[PDB]
Amino acid sequence: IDPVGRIQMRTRRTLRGHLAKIYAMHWGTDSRLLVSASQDGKLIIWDSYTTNKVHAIPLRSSWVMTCAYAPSGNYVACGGLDNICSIYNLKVRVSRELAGHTGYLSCCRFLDDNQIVTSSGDTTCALWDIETGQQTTTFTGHTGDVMSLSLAPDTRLFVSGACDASAKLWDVREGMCRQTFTGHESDINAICFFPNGNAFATGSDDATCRLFDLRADQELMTYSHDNIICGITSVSFSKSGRLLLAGYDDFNCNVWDALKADRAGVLAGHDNRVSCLGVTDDGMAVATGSWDSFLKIWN
């Protein structure tokens, strides 16, 4: 293939106001509005271009570990250690203090205006209907806590990572697990699909990234260097697919070649562990959040 070598990846903005560590962010479908919340009990919806606090939502549970922004830009989701997923109507008050999980929440991603898939510390991923108020299906089959969750870019299947160095591809419609993948040594900290929808990439605290597919149903390839030792906090993707990303505990976001199997860039500018990382739905620019409370928007 033709290597891309290095990419001069430069910041374009910095976002301030959070009073503690950022735990997760989400890129909207219009790329303009971003949502991220901290461990001080504050959600904020940011104007990503202009750096304007569009909204600052307080939280009842200051121990919060996942956030979501609806694909229709209508709602947001907020989950944390109090086990209740709050669905917030932006048009901001609680739409549904929607509950049903036992473990702490780790990742929730809307399917439409009405359905939400949640991962928790109960080791079971639950698909919920906000209108009904209760679960509409529940996926089991994992052992460790499902910390990572990523939707397919067709709203039909999803992947979950569960602290046991394995991931489950499950079908939303069938309500069951379709395939399982291994290859790691530690927790699955974050997982994401390849934007086409026939492959996905995994990050684990064993300082190793991996890329599998649902077509061949085997570990396609892996990403690792001897000088990297911290755990992959988060991953994302670029539309082309020649790149993937990986936030790290070692203070920086390493951007690697998704095919040539070599590092292609490093984003510094973070004073603490990198906890959040997303790519806009049009591929314009990455955003990362770290325990600094400083979200910044690379490009």
């Binding site: 990846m9 597919d213 697919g241 020649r242 620019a285």
Partner: peptide, 29 residues
């Protein structure tokens, strides 16, 4: 494998990370 390479080849044109764009089509610049 090969399908991923074809997808990379076909959709590289809309990747403001693989091909950074000047301020003409760059809202962040």
């Amino acid at each position: 494998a090969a399908d991923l390479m074809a997808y990379c080849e076909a959709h590289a044109k809309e990747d403001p990370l693989l091909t950074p764009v000047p301020a003409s089509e760059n809202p962040f610049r």
